[PDB]
């Protein structure tokens, strides 16, 4: 009974309806590719490894995990039906960080920064 991580969110589901839309293509090519290069992106580039980071309570509190590594794979795999489903995953990722941690925490400042930028970039999407 060592701590383990849960399986990650799925990034493939052949039975799920999906599309490659202009807006989804933009979410990959512009928005995620951008965010992924930010100085504060690194904690969010993969599922939280609660074993490595010694956070045995993380997955007790966070029951809908999400990260930008899972997002990237989903966009690459054309997993989504529309851009809104993708934007929802970004919001879950941010909101998870705010739930688990506290205002003022370094990890919270990082999320807040990425989130301001994500919002700036999706303010105008393709048609």
């Amino acid at each position: 009974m060592g701590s383990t991580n849960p399986p990650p969110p799925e990034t493939s589901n052949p039975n799920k309806p999906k599309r490659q839309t202009n807006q989804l293509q933009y979410l990959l090519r512009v928005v995620l590719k951008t965010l992924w290069k930010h100085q504060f992106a690194w904690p969010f580039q993969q599922p939280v490894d609660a074993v490595k980071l010694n956070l045995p309570d993380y997955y007790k509190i966070i029951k809908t995990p999400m990260d930008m590594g899972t997002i990237k794979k989903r966009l690459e795999n054309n997993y989504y039906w529309n851009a809104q489903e993708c934007i929802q995953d970004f919001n879950t990722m941010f909101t998870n960080c705010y739930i688990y941690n506290k205002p003022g925490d370094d990890i919270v400042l990082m999320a807040e920064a990425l989130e301001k930028l994500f919002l700036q970039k999706i303010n105008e999407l393709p048609t």
Partner: peptide, 7 residues
């Protein structure tokens, strides 16, 4: 657990 020291 926490990700950092309490500020």
């Amino acid at each position: 657990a926490t990700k950092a020291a309490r500020k």
